[PDB]
Design a binder for this molecule. Structure first.
Ligand SMILES: *[C@@H]1O[C@H](CO)[C@@H](O[C@@H]2O[C@H](CO)[C@@H](O[C@@H]3O[C@H](CO[C@H]4O[C@H](CO)[C@@H](O)[C@H](O[C@H]5O[C@H](CO)[C@@H](O)[C@H](O)[C@@H]5O)[C@@H]4O)[C@@H](O)[C@H](O[C@H]4O[C@H](CO)[C@@H](O)[C@H](O)[C@@H]4O)[C@@H]3O)[C@H](O)[C@H]2NC(C)=O)[C@H](O)[C@H]1NC(C)=O
Ligand SMILES: *[C@@H]1O[C@H](CO)[C@@H](O[C@@H]2O[C@H](CO)[C@@H](O)[C@H](O)[C@H]2NC(C)=O)[C@H](O)[C@H]1NC(C)=O
Ligand SMILES: *[C@@H]1O[C@H](CO)[C@@H](O[C@@H]2O[C@H](CO)[C@@H](O)[C@H](O)[C@H]2NC(C)=O)[C@H](O)[C@H]1NC(C)=O
Ligand SMILES: *[C@@H]1O[C@H](CO)[C@@H](O[C@@H]2O[C@H](CO)[C@@H](O)[C@H](O)[C@H]2NC(C)=O)[C@H](O)[C@H]1NC(C)=O
Ligand SMILES: *[C@@H]1O[C@H](CO)[C@@H](O[C@@H]2O[C@H](CO)[C@@H](O)[C@H](O)[C@H]2NC(C)=O)[C@H](O)[C@H]1NC(C)=O
Ligand SMILES: *[C@@H]1O[C@H](CO)[C@@H](O)[C@H](O)[C@H]1NC(C)=O
Ligand SMILES: *[C@@H]1O[C@H](CO)[C@@H](O)[C@H](O)[C@H]1NC(C)=O
Ligand SMILES: *[C@@H]1O[C@H](CO)[C@@H](O)[C@H](O)[C@H]1NC(C)=O
Ligand SMILES: *[C@@H]1O[C@H](CO)[C@@H](O)[C@H](O)[C@H]1NC(C)=O
Ligand SMILES: [Ca+2]
Ligand SMILES: [Ca+2]
Ligand SMILES: [Ca+2]
Ligand SMILES: [Ca+2]
Ligand SMILES: [Ca+2]
Ligand SMILES: [Ca+2]
Ligand SMILES: [Mg+2]
Lengths: 427, 449
């Protein structure tokens, strides 16, 4: 074994070398041979009152039961805080319960491509505010909607820069407004009528290359916080477009080399830095959408389904729907997407110290049990359903003498479990 | 491991000029051995031209002076000289990023302005066709070469080509240009010999008339927005003595990206290599060099936005480089080796260069830039050793700026050029640009054993 082959010179070393090791201190043991298996020691005449064997532990510290109310007074995950003392190489496992709340508020921000092919769509979305509100009455008791528009970076080569085309990027007869990156038209409000009023006043625009600059807008919607109005509720971002998307690296064609900084840069409700920061990368959006608990609904036309479906596989808590040619079906699209998103829970953890590892096992409905990366998720979660996760943590070092802490939480939610780690390195 | 990192030579250019955006070696012989540095936002003495961009000549010996490729301001539309009431320009040299690319071969220097645009002499456009200037015979003749300044205007044609966005010389001095915007950003590769360029150079006529020019063809609209020519390199991959064209196509194939190798004789497609993740920008950077001493050039491709996952489950942008070893019957589509960055948002694989054989052990080595790597995100350059089994998976050296971080990113490692011996000691040297702070750094190989 590796208890003896460690040559433990002290009880200390003996601990860090093997979870199956124990240490004798009697000096009635006929050197490093005092470090042997818990059985190999008893078989060699070591009183259990002498075999020093520190073991890891679990102590739950906060444990409000799942609910059955303001959102913050609603509990969907338990426990909320625990302490794990970790013997090197010995996992400590605990159970997370997740219960889908019966009724939870929804903030939905409708972020719309307003390039010229979306002109007919814009005509339909004119009543979307009130129609969606009416539908949502049967989904939640507390719904708010907002609206933003995007087109493109306002620089060569993505837009034409002749004086005429800057005034009107479209044909002479088409009365398009000047190209713009992103306009935060309407912050989240419970007044659907106001959504109708404002969206009805928006002017369609245009630009030159087919992919659009919506990733610039998504980033702003994710990180602009109170300017958008997000509450700590279900946050839905509907991204509506009939084209593909620019991303990081595309900016170099326009001489834009600074990476997106992922900070808010709205002035007078407009994004002002599209000429200065590159489009975000997918990974950057992943970071910022996740961090801000945004669940994305890609409402995109048939021809770009292939692209957005791959995008959806890279962005956690996202869904894809097929938008009709004039957004006529967008309400049912949004409903279907919300239902899909709400019925799946995905756990993430914060960064662990070196030598520390985490494994998940999920226990879902109809005895569907996930392991590996699938242990982080459950699917087909209906309203009121409970699911559970067995979460195992192991230290294989002596990571610090200082305690660590990290969070486990379901993507899209503020609620989280604080896991405090303590490392047994000494006797 | 033998580059002198303790005391490299730091070149500095004008602030905000982006001095260091491109870097190159120049040797019309040897006594005039020099470093070339592109500064695409530099102001020039060209009348009426704001930030035309410049290329600096830096003689290596005992510092940097701009080369006068073009002393003139933006030309005027001849029909407006008096027919109309008010001259107007036919082209737009302001903000054109001249020196975004600088390449040299013998006593020739190619420098490109990928944001150069022009009006055409017909309907008024704002067509960023791009242009290049070619110095030949050590500055005794200067040619403009703008193969995308053609009869076929606007985005549908070559109007948005941005020719010279990437560029390279072959070993015989043939010019190879990437223009990612041709045909609604399908992108294009165009190539001509210097003789062919000089043979039809006639500045009185703005449209390109080079005869014998090689270029890729317009494809159907399903290929739009691919950016072929985002990057370019050259190497021998076809079994003859005419170097072939390696081009990045980073948005091709659903934004998975691919890299293509074109027959250097007739620009016909020979090989494709596919990226592994959507929007990872596979093809952002490309290089070709023999990394295992068998005399067959090998392919390296950068994908600096490659997102992978930590063992504890966290996604992170880190970037990845892919290496494909050539063999006598061809070259396989799946990489022999991958190298992955460790710094979140570091953009590992943003730049690649052959180093030649840095330690003279019989195997050529490679540098890979990660312009936002390092503990203060200033950028990092990794040297990877060649060997009999290919490129090593661990760097033999790691270069970082010796100056502190500042208010704005350094971009150290965003431009690289190795493979030449600057000081004649028989060990190849390395130029690293750090354009965010308007510096370039020269590293010299120290002798070994
Ligand atoms: C690496 O990966 C790249 C990218 O996938 C591959 O490049 C692509 O290869 C395919 C297959 O060869 C190309 O599609 C074909 O294009 C040829 C080119 O035809 C040319 O010559 C014709 C004869 O003179 C001419 O008619 C064509 O002109 C027409 O089309 C252009 C563009 O639409 C238009 O401008 C013209 O007005 C004409 O309308 C053109 O100049 C073509 O002949 C092929 O036709 C076959 O397939 C089509 C569809 O399946 C079918 O309709 C035909 O009947 C015929 O069966 C086909 O269109 C594609 O263009 C390449 N894309 C790019 C960007 O280069 C490459 O092959 C890969 N390399 C390797 C080594 O794997
Ligand atoms: C959403 O919830 C977060 C977390 O509960 C709130 O931010 C916290 O605010 C309290 C007091 O304001 C601080 O003690 C915490 O340190 C904060 N944590 C974080 C991560 O910010 C946030 O204010 C809530 N947002 C809204 C819009 O209500
Ligand atoms: C998934 O795991 C669950 C564990 O909870 C399994 O269901 C339990 O099975 C045991 C015996 O097999 C019973 O004693 C429990 O009553 C079951 N629990 C419930 C809630 O029914 C389930 O069989 C596993 N399924 C698969 C496919 O492995
Ligand atoms: C190139 O020269 C122009 C003009 O002198 C510089 O632009 C000026 O910069 C100052 C300070 O930023 C401003 O107050 C002026 O309004 C600018 N003038 C114009 C016409 O833009 C520019 O900064 C110089 N660029 C470099 C790289 O040196
Ligand atoms: C690269 O292109 C050259 C030129 O098209 C090819 O060489 C030609 O090969 C054909 C055979 O199909 C001969 O009939 C011609 O005489 C050759 N021309 C020249 C100029 O050499 C060459 O085969 C191509 N290489 C590959 C690997 O396809
Ligand atoms: C969408 O366009 C079609 C055109 O055929 C039209 O019939 C339909 O009414 C439009 N959608 C809505 C919701 O009006
Ligand atoms: C979800 O679970 C229910 C059982 O409550 C089952 O009837 C249904 O088929 C499941 N749906 C899917 C998509 O697995
Ligand atoms: C090349 O030109 C430079 C001046 O720019 C000069 O100093 C150098 O001697 C010349 N070299 C040759 C070989 O003519
Ligand atoms: C295109 O992408 C698909 C899926 O990523 C891949 O299987 C295929 O090999 C790629 N083809 C080319 C020519 O890049
Ligand atoms: Ca439409
Ligand atoms: Ca666009
Ligand atoms: Ca060849
Ligand atoms: Ca080789
Ligand atoms: Ca070597
Ligand atoms: Ca040297
Ligand atoms: Mg559009």
């Amino acid at each position: 074994n590796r208890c003896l082959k460690a040559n433990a010179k002290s009880c200390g070393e003996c601990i860090q070398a093997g979870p199956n090791c124990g240490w004798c201190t009697n000096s009635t043991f006929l050197t490093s041979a005092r470090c042997d298996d818990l059985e190999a020691l008893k078989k060699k005449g070591c009183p259990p009152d002498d075999i020093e064997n520190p073991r890891g532990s679990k102590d739950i510290k906060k444990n409000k039961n799942v609910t059955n109310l303001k959102p913050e007074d609603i509990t969907q995950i338990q426990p909320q805080q625990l302490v794990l003392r970790l013997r090197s190489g010995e996992p400590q496992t605990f159970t997370l319960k997740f219960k889908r709340a019966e009724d939870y508020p929804i903030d939905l921000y409708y972020l719309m491509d307003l390039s010229y092919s979306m002109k007919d769509d814009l005509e339909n979305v004119k009543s979307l505010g009130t129609d969606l509100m009416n539908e949502m009455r049967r989904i939640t008791s507390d719904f708010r909607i907002g609206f933003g528009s995007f087109v493109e970076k306002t620089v060569m080569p993505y837009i034409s820069t002749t004086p005429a085309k800057l005034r009107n990027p479209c044909t002479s007869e088409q009365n398009c407004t000047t190209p713009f990156s992103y306009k935060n038209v309407l912050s989240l409000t419970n007044k659907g009528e106001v959504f109708n009023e404002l969206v009805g006043k928006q002017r369609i625009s245009g630009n030159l290359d087919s992919p659009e600059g919506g990733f610039d807008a998504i980033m702003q919607v994710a990180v602009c916080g109170s300017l958008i109005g997000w509450r700590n509720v279900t946050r839905l971002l509907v991204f509506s477009t009939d084209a593909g998307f620019h991303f990081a690296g595309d900016g170099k064609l326009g001489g834009i080399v600074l990476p997106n900084d992922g900070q808010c840069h709205l002035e007078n409700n407009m994004y002002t830095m599209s000429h200065y920061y590159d489009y975000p990368s997918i990974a950057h959006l992943v970071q910022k959408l996740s961090e801000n608990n945004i669940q994305t609904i890609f409402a995109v036309t048939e021809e770009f389904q292939p692209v957005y479906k791959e995008l959806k596989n890279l962005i956690p808590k996202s869904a894809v729907g097929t938008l009709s040619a004039n957004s006529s079906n967008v309400i049912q699209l949004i409903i279907d997407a919300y239902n899909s998103l709400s019925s799946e829970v995905i756990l993430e953890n914060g960064k662990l110290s070196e030598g520390v590892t985490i494994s998940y096992k999920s226990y879902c409905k109809n005895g569907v049990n996930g392991t590996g990366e699938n242990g982080r998720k459950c699917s087909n979660i209906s309203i009121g359903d409970e699911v559970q996760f067995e979460i195992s943590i192991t230290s294989n070092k002596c990571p610090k003498k200082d305690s660590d802490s990290f969070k486990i939480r379901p993507l899209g939610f503020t609620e989280e479990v604080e896991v405090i780690l303590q490392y047994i390195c000494e006797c | 491991f033998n580059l002198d990192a303790e005391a490299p030579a730091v070149l500095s250019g004008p602030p905000g000029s982006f001095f260091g955006f491109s870097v190159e070696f120049y040797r019309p012989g040897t006594d005039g051995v020099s470093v070339l540095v592109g500064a695409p936002k530099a102001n020039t003495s060209q009348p009426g031209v704001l930030q035309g961009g410049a290329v600096y000549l830096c003689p290596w010996g005992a510092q940097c002076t701009p080369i006068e490729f073009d002393s003139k301001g933006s030309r005027l539309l001849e029909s407006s000289l008096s027919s109309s009431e008010g001259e107007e320009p036919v082209e737009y040299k302001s903000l054109q990023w001249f020196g975004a690319t600088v390449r040299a071969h013998g006593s020739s220097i190619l420098a490109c302005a990928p944001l150069y645009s022009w009006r055409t002499e017909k309907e008024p456009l704002s067509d960023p066709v791009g242009t290049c200037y070619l110095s030949t015979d050590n500055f005794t003749r200067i040619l403009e070469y703008a193969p995308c300044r053609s009869d076929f205007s606007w985005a549908a044609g070559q109007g948005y080509c941005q020719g010279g966005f990437s560029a390279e010389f072959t070993k015989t001095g043939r010019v190879v240009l990437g223009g990612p915007g041709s045909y609604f950003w399908q992108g294009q590769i165009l190539s001509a010999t210097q003789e062919q360029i000089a043979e039809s150079y006639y500045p009185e006529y703005l449209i390109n008339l080079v005869q014998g020019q090689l270029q890729t063809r317009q494809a159907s609209s399903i290929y739009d927005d691919s950016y072929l020519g985002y990057s370019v390199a050259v190497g021998e991959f076809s079994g003859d003595d005419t170097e072939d064209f390696v081009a990045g196509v980073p948005k091709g194939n659903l934004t998975y990206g691919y890299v293509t190798i074109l027959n250097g004789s007739d620009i016909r497609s020979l090989y494709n290599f596919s990226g592994e993740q959507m929007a990872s920008y596979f093809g952002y950077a490309v290089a070709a060099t023999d990394v295992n001493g068998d005399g067959l050039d090998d392919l390296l491709v950068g994908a600096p936005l490659l997102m992978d996952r930590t063992p504890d489950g966290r996604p992170q942008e880190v970037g990845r480089v892919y290496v494909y070893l050539q063999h006598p019957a061809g070259i396989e589509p799946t990489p022999t080796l991958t190298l992955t960055g460790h710094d979140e948002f570091g953009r590992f694989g943003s730049s690649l260069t052959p180093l030649g054989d840095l330690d003279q052990d019989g195997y050529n080595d490679v540098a890979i830039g990660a312009p936002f790597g390092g503990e203060t995100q200033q950028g990092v350059v990794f040297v990877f050793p060649g060997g009999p089994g290919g490129l090593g998976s661990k760097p033999s050296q790691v270069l970082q700026p010796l100056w502190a971080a500042s208010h704005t990113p350094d971009f150290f490692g965003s431009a690289l050029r190795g493979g030449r011996d600057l000081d004649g000691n028989g060990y190849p040297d390395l130029i690293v640009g750090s354009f965010g702070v308007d510096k370039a750094v020269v590293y010299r190989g120290r002798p070994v054993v």
